[PDB]
Design an enzyme around this catalytic site. Structure first.
Site, mmCIF file in Angstrom:
data_model
loop_
_atom_site.group_PDB
_atom_site.id
_atom_site.type_symbol
_atom_site.label_atom_id
_atom_site.label_comp_id
_atom_site.label_asym_id
_atom_site.label_seq_id
_atom_site.Cartn_x
_atom_site.Cartn_y
_atom_site.Cartn_z
ATOM 1 N N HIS A 1 -6.455 7.369 -2.724
ATOM 2 C CA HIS A 1 -7.359 6.408 -2.092
ATOM 3 C C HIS A 1 -6.703 5.579 -0.990
ATOM 4 C CE1 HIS A 1 -5.561 3.092 -4.356
ATOM 5 N NE2 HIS A 1 -6.259 2.290 -3.568
ATOM 6 N N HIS B 1 0.826 -1.213 0.000
ATOM 7 C CA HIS B 1 0.000 0.000 0.000
ATOM 8 C C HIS B 1 0.863 1.267 0.000
ATOM 9 C CE1 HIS B 1 -3.005 -3.000 1.403
ATOM 10 N NE2 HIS B 1 -3.784 -2.285 0.609
ATOM 11 N N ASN C 1 -4.851 -6.364 -9.701
ATOM 12 C CA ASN C 1 -3.557 -7.034 -9.875
ATOM 13 C C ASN C 1 -3.659 -8.378 -10.607
ATOM 14 O OD1 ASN C 1 -2.338 -6.154 -6.512
ATOM 15 N ND2 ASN C 1 -2.593 -4.865 -8.324
ATOM 16 N N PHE D 1 -8.819 -15.889 -3.694
ATOM 17 C CA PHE D 1 -9.027 -14.454 -3.920
ATOM 18 C C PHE D 1 -9.690 -14.201 -5.266
ATOM 19 C CE2 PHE D 1 -6.827 -10.172 -4.967
ATOM 20 C CZ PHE D 1 -7.770 -9.431 -4.271
HETATM 21 C C1 LIG Z 1 -1.989 -9.681 -5.603
HETATM 22 C C2 LIG Z 1 -2.901 -8.939 -4.675
HETATM 23 O O1 LIG Z 1 -3.382 -9.883 -3.710
HETATM 24 C C3 LIG Z 1 -4.289 -9.452 -2.780
HETATM 25 C C4 LIG Z 1 -4.604 -8.135 -2.522
HETATM 26 C C5 LIG Z 1 -5.536 -7.803 -1.533
HETATM 27 C C6 LIG Z 1 -6.160 -8.806 -0.797
HETATM 28 C C7 LIG Z 1 -5.829 -10.136 -1.060
HETATM 29 C C8 LIG Z 1 -4.916 -10.469 -2.036
HETATM 30 O O2 LIG Z 1 -4.540 -11.748 -2.354
HETATM 31 C C9 LIG Z 1 -4.717 -12.730 -1.337
HETATM 32 C C10 LIG Z 1 -7.176 -8.483 0.272
HETATM 33 C C11 LIG Z 1 -7.770 -7.103 0.077
HETATM 34 N N1 LIG Z 1 -6.685 -6.140 -0.120
HETATM 35 C C12 LIG Z 1 -6.438 -5.128 0.732
HETATM 36 O O3 LIG Z 1 -5.576 -4.279 0.581
HETATM 37 C C13 LIG Z 1 -5.842 -6.343 -1.307
HETATM 38 MG MG LIG Z 2 -7.555 0.931 0.599
HETATM 39 ZN ZN LIG Z 3 -5.804 0.289 -2.642
#
Ligand SMILES: CCOc1cc2c(cc1OC)CCN(C=O)C2
Ligand SMILES: [Mg+2]
Ligand SMILES: [Zn+2]
Ligand SMILES: CCOc1cc2c(cc1OC)CCN(C=O)C2
Ligand SMILES: [Mg+2]
Ligand SMILES: [Mg+2]
Ligand SMILES: [Mg+2]
Ligand SMILES: [Zn+2]
Lengths: 325, 323
Positions: free
Chosen positions: A114, A74, A235, A286
Site C-alpha cells: 500500500h 513510509h 500507531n 491527530f
Molecule cells: C505517529 C503517526 O503520526 C502521524 C502519522 C500520519 C499523519 C500524522 C501523524 O501525526 C501527526 C498524517 C497522515 N499520515 C500520512 O502518512 C500519517
Molecule cells: Mg499511503
Molecule cells: Zn501507509
C-alpha cells in the site's frame, strides 16, 4: 540462534503490539518478508492458492526492496506493521467466516503494497512541485495510484507471480479489490470513508451466529477499505514504546519535507516546520480529529472486540496530553 | 491557403468542413482550427500567449495524435475543439463562463484524445497493457491523454500558459483534468443524470439565460458540453456524419480483428463478420446520443433545436438504409 530469537518473536504475529522494530532487526531488515510469510503460513494461503514458497519469498523480497530504506516512516517497517495489523483485524470475532479466502488475500496483499516506493513527501508536495508523479496521475491520488502500479508490476518479475495459480476470474476479482482498498488509503478520502462507516454502524445487521452481515460487494469492500485504513492509522493505538517511535519517524519525514518547502519559498505544510512545531499537540490533535473518530467507529462496528485497542488509544492520548502543560 | 482561409470562415458554424480543412492544411486541422478559434475569442491577448509558442505547442500536440488510427486522430480532435467552440456560444449560456473556463474547455477539447492507440479502455484492461497497469484500470485512456497533453507543455517553446498567474494555472489544470476525465464513456450515465437534475432545477433570467452560481454546477455543464461535442458526429450534416461512421467502424473492426487474433470476447460493433453498421448507428443515437442531446437541448432551450433536428433527420436516414 538469531533465527531462533526471530521465530520466538514471530509467535506474537496474532497479537496487537507485535515488536515490529525488533523483528526488523532480527530479520536483517526484512520485516515485511518474514511477517508476510508467517501470516500466509498461519492462514494456509500457500496451500489454498497453490503459491510456490520460492515464488512468495522472491516477490516479498523484491517488494520489500522497492520500499525506501532511507525514508524514516513510509518504509518496509511501516508496510509490515500495516500488514500485521490488518491480519489481526481480520481475525476479530465479529468477522469470523465473513470474508472469503480471496478477500482475505486481497486485504493482506493490499496492505503489503500500500505504500511501496513512497518517496517520503505528501501528495500535496508532489502536486505543488510539479513532480513527474503528479503529472503522470493528474493530481489525483498520486502516491496511491503509484503504489498500486509498482505493487502489481513487480508480479511480472522473474519468479514473482504469486497469483500464477489463481483462476482468471480470481485474478480479476483480486485486482479490483486491491485497487479499491489501496485507493482508500488516500487521506483526502478519509472523511467520506468515515461518514460511510458511520452509516453502516448505524444500520448494521448481524447474523444468527453473531457476525457481521455483508451481502453485497459495496458493503464488503467498504469494510475492507476501512479495515486497512484503520491499520494504516493504527500507531496511536499501539503500546506507547511503539507509538513514540512512530511519532519520531513521522516527524523526521515531516520536518525534512518542510525543509524542502522552506528552501523553495513555499508555504510549509502543517506540522512540517521544525522551528514552529509542537510534536505533542500535533499528536493530540491527530488523535482527536482523525484517529479516535475512526477507531471509535470501527470499535462500534465490531463491538466489543476492539475495546482493548480503543482503551490503549485513549490512554496514549491522555499521556501525550499530559506532556503539554 | 485562400481556399483554406475561406473554409475557416465557417468556424462559428455547426458542420464546418473539417475533412476539407484537414486536406487543405497539410493534415494540420487541429493546429489551424485552434489558432483560428484563439483569435476569434481573443484568447491570445487575454492570456498573453505568444503566437509562436501557440503554434509550436499545437504542432507538437498534433504530432502526438496517431496518423494510422482511423477515428481517434487529429481530425477528430479538431472537430471536437470546433464543436465545443460553437456550444460555448449557445445563447442560453451567454455570460455563464469566465475566460479561464472558456480556455479550459477549448484546451481540454484539443488534448482530450492525444496519443490514442485506437483501442478501447476495456481492450487495454483485458490485455494487461502497460497503460492499464499504470492507471489501475481506471479511465485508462483519459488519464493518459491528460498526462501527454500537459507534459508536452514542457517542450522547448511549448508553454502556452507561461504568462498565466500561478493561481490561474492551478485553476486551469484542475478544470482541464475534470473535463477530459468526463469524456470516459463509462461516466456517461452519471453525467447525463447530473445534466437532467440540472435541467429539472434550472434557474434562468427573464431573457432565457442560465444562471449557474456554483463551480460544481458550472464544471458539470462544461463536462457535459465537451462530452456532447465528443458525441456530436450524428448531429452534423450527413455527408460529414457518414465519413465519421466509416472511420469509427474501421477502427472498431481493426480492434475486433485483435480480440480474434488473440482470442477474446469480441467488443460490440467490432466483429466485421457479424456487424450491422447502420443498425449500430441507429442504436447509438437512440440509447446514447439522442438522450444526451435531448437533455442538453432542454438545458439551453430552445437554442439546440437545429442541432437536435439534424440528429433526428440523420437517424431517420440511417433507419431508411436498413431493409
Ligand atoms: C505517529 C503517526 O503520526 C502521524 C502519522 C500520519 C499523519 C500524522 C501523524 O501525526 C501527526 C498524517 C497522515 N499520515 C500520512 O502518512 C500519517
Ligand atoms: Mg499511503
Ligand atoms: Zn501507509
Ligand atoms: C460516427 C461515430 O459513431 C460512434 C462513435 C463512438 C461510439 C460509437 C459510435 O457509433 C456506433 C462509441 C463511443 N466512442 C468511442 O470513441 C465513439
Ligand atoms: Mg529500497
Ligand atoms: Mg522511489
Ligand atoms: Mg476519448
Ligand atoms: Zn474523442
Amino acid at each position: 540462534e538469531q533465527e531462533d530469537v526471530l521465530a520466538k518473536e514471530l509467535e506474537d504475529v496474532n497479537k496487537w503490539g507485535l515488536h515490529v522494530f525488533r523483528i526488523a532487526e532480527l530479520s536483517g531488515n526484512r520485516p515485511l518478508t518474514v511477517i508476510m510469510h508467517t501470516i500466509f503460513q498461519e492462514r494456509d494461503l500457500l496451500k489454498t492458492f497453490k503459491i510456490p514458497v520460492d515464488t512468495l519469498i522472491t516477490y516479498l523480497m523484491t517488494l520489500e526492496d522497492h520500499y525506501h530504506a532511507d525514508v524514516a516512516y513510509h518504509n518496509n517497517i511501516h508496510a509490515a506493521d500495516v500488514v500485521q495489523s490488518t491480519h489481526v483485524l481480520l481475525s476479530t470475532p465479529a468477522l469470523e467466516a465473513v470474508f472469503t479466502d480471496l478477500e482475505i488475500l486481497a486485504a493482506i496483499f493490499a496492505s503489503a503494497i500500500h505504500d511501496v516506493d513512497h518517496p517520503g513527501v505528501s501528495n500535496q508536495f508532489l502536486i505543488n512541485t510539479n513532480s513527474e508523479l503528479a503529472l503522470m496521475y493528474n493530481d489525483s491520488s498520486v502516491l496511491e495510484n503509484h503504489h498500486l502500479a509498482v505493487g502489481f508490476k513487480l508480479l511480472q518479475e522473474e519468479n514473482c507471480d504469486i497469483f500464477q495459480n489463481l483462476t482468471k476470474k480470481q485474478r480479476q476479482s483480486l485486482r479490483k479489490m486491491v485497487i479499491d482498498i489501496v485507493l482508500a488509503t488516500d487521506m483526502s478520502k478519509h472523511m467520506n470513508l468515515l461518514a460511510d462507516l458511520k452509516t453502516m454502524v448505524e444500520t448494521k445487521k448481524v447474523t444468527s451466529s453473531g457476525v457481521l452481515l455483508l451481502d453485497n460487494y459495496s458493503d464488503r469492500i467498504q469494510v475492507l477499505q476501512n479495515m486497512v485504513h484503520c491499520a494504516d492509522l493504527s500507531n496511536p493505538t499501539k503500546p506507547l514504546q511503539l507509538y513514540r517511535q512512530w511519532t519520531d519517524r513521522i516527524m523526521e519525514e515531516f520536518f525534512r519535507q518542510g525543509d524542502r518547502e522552506r528552501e523553495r519559498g513555499m508555504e510549509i505544510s502543517p506540522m512540517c516546520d521544525k522551528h514552529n512545531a509542537s510534536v505533542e499537540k500535533s499528536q493530540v490533535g491527530f488523535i482527536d480529529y482523525i484517529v479516535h473518530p475512526l477507531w471509535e467507529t470501527w470499535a462500534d462496528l465490531v463491538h466489543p472486540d476492539a475495546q482493548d485497542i480503543l482503551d490503549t488509544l485513549e490512554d496514549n492520548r491522555e499521556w501525550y496530553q499530559s506532556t503539554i502543560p
